[model samples]
Target chain A: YEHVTRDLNPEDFWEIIGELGDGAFGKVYKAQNKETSVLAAAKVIDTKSEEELEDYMVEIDILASCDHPNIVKLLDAFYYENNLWILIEFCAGGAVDAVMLELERPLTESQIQVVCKQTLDALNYLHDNKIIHRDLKAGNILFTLDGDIKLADFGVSAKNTRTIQRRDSFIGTPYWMAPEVVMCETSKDRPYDYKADVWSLGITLIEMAEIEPPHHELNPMRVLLKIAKSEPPTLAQPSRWSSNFKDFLKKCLEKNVDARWTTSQLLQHPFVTVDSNKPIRELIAEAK
Target chain B: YEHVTRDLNPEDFWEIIGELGDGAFGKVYKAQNKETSVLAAAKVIDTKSEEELEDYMVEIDILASCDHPNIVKLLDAFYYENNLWILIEFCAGGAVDAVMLELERPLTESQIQVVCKQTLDALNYLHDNKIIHRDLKAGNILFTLDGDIKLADFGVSAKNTRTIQRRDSFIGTPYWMAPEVVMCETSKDRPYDYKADVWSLGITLIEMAEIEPPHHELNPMRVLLKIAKSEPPTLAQPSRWSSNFKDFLKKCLEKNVDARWTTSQLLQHPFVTVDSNKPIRELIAEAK
Candidate 1:
């Protein structure tokens, strides 16, 4: 029951591959373990305040809460000194947005539909569990090496859906935030629900079609304002896409938070119900 | 350059020893590696919020960057599911603050000096690297099984020495906060420097002697206001301690942040430089 020995550093198991990105909080690296030789995406965070320390504890705890084919799983988390090293399931397919950057043109309806369906399935489980992934976007969504898609970051989520117990904090990335959340900034107390995610999902769909977020050129505050004021987004070229796909976006982008379609409903839509048995490489090849 | 296999999950590497503590963010557990049977202190944190995710990255990154005898070193950062599991070097000696729990009395001047020396050395390195360990209490300092002391937790530290880009944020525990940082709360934007840490150090020394933080029972915000409004603090049993010790406290507690002793200067003080050929457990076991 009390088996013990000496020190055990994760370095013995995992080694840094190379830096991916760096920030004030920490840096990400393409890393691997010595024992298993498995690749990993490791984030080394710097904790210097209570707020910063809380970030570490909350992320890992959330990562543990999810287990779905379309949701990224946590691999490892190690802490050294003031820095916390988090090893998460590696996504060799990188982020959806990242892949889009390499493309000469925006995604085909088929490609977008494939990724959307996978993500909706993931979101279905997330919402059913009473967790709303307040920020769901292309960058926060990843693909496996084989091109299977999964949700990556759940850093701004909340539990207890459908409750009017409005949280005081304004949480979520600017572009993907729900209008109700934006209202919370000025109004100070506005309740939001799982429908907030549907709003973000709709925006994500637009990003795929138009190859840019709605009001993309504006600063963050302006983007928030535009999101609150703008009509439900439509496809960049409605003629090039199916009515079902267009309807899917309409349901997701419903301005009335109460009217937004839930993930389960979205999954049953014609856009998601479309055949998606093609090889993942086919989608990647098209993006490239 | 490429490492590939499978199963990067932390569950594949370590097992929980027992529950150490729990928080809304996550739980702290004493854990061990399955392959090597090496021990660690693992903090499992939830990452459901952006703020919490940032906390994870900052702590791990800070820990990875710091390499010093006096600072605690990170061992591993692996996450499972949505939970981030941060594994760090285990301190068999636990915290210096806990020593009082089993004590019949307060620590000897020599005992306090021993811990202080190790911590001052830590501050020296941290300050040299532009890190103000704003939280420098005994609880944040740890002891190795070999009795070596190491500073841990950079949860409220700032890198870069002496930049007037004065952090608008008033970070740090209330009881341990410097007057200058407290000013930032009401004054809108007040900038302080490494000297802020010196103020905390003086408070920590008093805690070691008296066995609690200054204004221990007061409301946190009130503590901050008092720390700023009141004069510099001193020990309750000031007469019983040595003049050298008392003067050391006075130098560290200077209300004028500009006049506070630097870490390097404190390293040379008689209290730190004094030869005490004593082991750390000698102090711990005796207290227990």
Candidate 2:
């Protein structure tokens, strides 16, 4: 039996607004609390496989441990109709990936800076607490109505114990996977630490800047090989960005796991060190 | 007759505290106002030729036309002892060069950022108004007690006329001279514009990062030859500094005159674009 809260009938508590779409795991829905009138995102995944249930437990544990303003809050959970319905806090501004998809454009430099800064802050917090967000990508970065970030999707995250400081799992969205993570499948010694997330953060930055991650045109399997074998990816037109942004990306995308900047060090990077009060609501409005 | 307002007797108004040393063109002094007890810097230069007087006129004209918080203010000027005594606002924190000299060490990255940000702001203002600080070096950047910057030394600065957008002067400190400025002595077509200042600004950043600018070990005339003939200079240990800082220097030190970033463009560089509120008073205190 799952340790999550038991709500036999979610229909009694939440008014099902609409279905978002079918996620990789299951059906996703938009919902509103009947009593509180608060909006939420409800994911109803079929619990047929133990593997899926294990992943669910990981996500639940990670989300429950996180109490950051930048991370999405896990609202409620229920087992109903042979499916696990998980309700999480709703962000009207949506995922950064969805916004880029709808607008058919990359974010402005200022908007990208805001995203990088907020995301790095959250990464620093997570890494310091011994947790690694293994899947950091444009799609995982959610936004509030006021344009503040709320990093979501912890399904593949790993919490480090004192004895084990690294993970060897070949899990993550392919394009954003660090070289070490990609090497883990073939090499026994290719265990990666929190710095792997830094690499994904760099790819996410590239995604926000260019409207897609590097090697987006290639197949995911090919991309994993390319990322592991080739030199670290850089901006298509490096001259278009400020030196700070380019350098920040370079630091993040370093192929050598040992040489890659840690989340704490990256938080001090000039490109994202700015406490920018610039509103991102304009991008949200345009996307909406 | 010179158009500047002149006070014949500086002794009546000022109490000379100490001599700073001889500047290239004059004897620099520390002075205190007799009436207000306010401190000031007085440059007493022997007026030997029309060329020297002409340069002084240009400096006065440029200084009089300027009004900015980051710029040193012209307090008073006097014709005394067959010399020109020019009083300017005194910065208690002294020149950046002087601090480096006294401490026997270069500034930290944060201090360098503050210096770059403030200097770029001043440069942006000057460049926007068609005035170019042809001689921008570490020695020219003065600091207040609160660690705010005050740009000084406009002796070689040029005001761009409508028809004449570029200067062919072979002036400026040799170590900090741009390639175009050095080439002006040999090439008739090598007239440089305000971007030359950006080049010097880059060199100054290097001076702050390392204890000295590149080619400091070489003779000044040979440095001029090296600068014009060799590639643009870079930080000795590039790994020691942040990417943003390195890139900022690269953009500023481009060998091609036309390819160099303008002060306006450089202002937007991530290394200097940040409105850093980090206190540099600690550096000032350490130097003092």
Candidate 3:
């Protein structure tokens, strides 16, 4: 339904307003189009090094192939003043990780179910395309102003043959990473598949229930060790939650890779497949 | 035909891409919407200074009141993290100053006539709103990628800084300043009105023809002195152009403020009323 050619002059289109945040490459800022007046989030990458520029370029290609209701949209991009400028959709509510922090109580059962369904749908869509969203955590999960959950940040994602083919290249946040995904650098490492993301999603669910992902008491390095060796994380006060809900978490957090529930299966799970007409707007407001 | 609300959360709608340009108050940037792929230019104003914020607010209010084919559009605005962000349409062809220079030769009479017509129409709309663009110049005159000419700064030479600094505070490139606009801090200085823009437009006409606003030999403060004291300027090589064209420029450059022609009167002039059936695409190509 859209055909925006990427051969745009950033100077010709957007006008940068202020710095939004900073990352490894450079800074992020809030911006708007001079003509269309559309709002956007801009990522400024220092094209100072060839390696960084190529890494920056890779995300655009992945973003180009990605056009789903549950993923971030790349609106316009360009190279200007010795830097690579990328303009993507701005989700107003910001990262779900950051949003849930102020909550004094965990989300209601119905509310968590809504997040589960939306994230699972996004995951199902990506996996269908053979794309692994290598990073899946509360921080990478963002919200639009209207309270729609979108899976974002494809900096570490890529497409690979799956079901049998897997990847051993280590990437992703250590706290939410799967044990196999944490496996070594050389040929001795076993390849992990999209199930790595599903494992992270389980961590995300626990994070959703309690303001932070599993092993919050440990530092990132220690958390990686936890992910690599600890028994599969379980929710606190498990008996206080519904049996079906606990069962869903059990399937998502299965330690053995082959025993893990697929995104499609999770979508059909009794606890996650909430049929309430409750929109994410209400779900998000619950955090406040 | 468009309904863009200026009230929005900066993060909700836009993602900042990169620095577009630095202006008097702050920087302008490239941005886009997360849900809509439309691009925009966001002006960054530091709210750290209340005076700048108020002056910036005045421009957005003026911009919100404007919407015409000849005028650039204000799509959205908001403040976040101490910077006020203003989003407007992105004019891809850049300003007419830059556009005319790219031609590297004199423009056709019809082309100049076409430029005059569009600008007059825009000015006419502003005059109807009783809003003076406050600033107008070849650099402020912008074009869409489709080649529609517009005014920019203190709003635009016509949807296109598409940022706005204060009319009085941002009077730069003084060659286009009307005698009244350059009347300085003297209590004897009666504030100018939209007729001031008429003078600037007249100056713009001469610029479109000669590739520089009249009195180019002078620096800005000196140019302001010249604009404030000298007699009306005339076009170079006058005989080569049509009588109607010469008359149009003469009316735009009239010295006595009381005697200057209005946008309503000038739009009816034979020179600007060239009535070319040429499509904008063809006319834009002709400029090349």
Q: For each candidate in turn, give its C-alpha RMSD to the true structure in angstroms.
A: 19.2, 26.5, 28.5
lDDT of model 2, residue B213 = 75
Worst-scoring 10-residue span by lDDT in model 1 chain B: B170-179
Q: What would the per-residue lDDT of candidate 3 be over residues A1-288, giving only the tens digit for each residue?
A: 122233456867888877765655568888989999898888877676644555555467667778888888888777655677778888877777676665555666666777778888899888877776756777778887776688887766655432123222212111211111222211112223567678778877887777656667665445544555667777886876788878888887876665877887788787766655355688666654
Runs off by more than 4 Å, candidate 1? A1-288, B1-7, B49-52, B161-192, B219-221, B275-279
After superposition, the stretches of candidate 3 with alpha carbons farther than 4 Å from their true spots are A1-11, A102-105, A161-192, A275-279, A283-288, B1-288
- C-alpha TM-scores of all predictions: 0.45, 0.45, 0.43
Angstrom error at residue A193, model 3: 0.8
Q: Write the per-residue lDDT of candidate 2 for residues B1-288, one digit (tens) a residue.
A: 244445468888998999875677768999999999999999888887544565477677777778999998888786665677778899888889888888999998889999999999899888777776766788889989887989998876666442122223212112211222223321212233456577778888888888777777775556545565567777888888899998888887776555778776777788986575355788887775
For candidate 2, give fnat to 2 decimals: 0.00
Alpha carbon lDDT at B238, candidate 2: 83
Supply the global lDDT for candidate 2.
0.73
Q: Which consecutive 10 residues in model 3 chain A have the weakest lDDT in total?
A: A172-181
Q: Model 2 Cα displacement at A286 (Å)?
A: 2.4
lDDT of 1 by residue, A43-119 (tens): 77676754455444555666776778888778877655666777788888767777778764566778788888888
Which candidate comes out best when scored by DockQ? 1
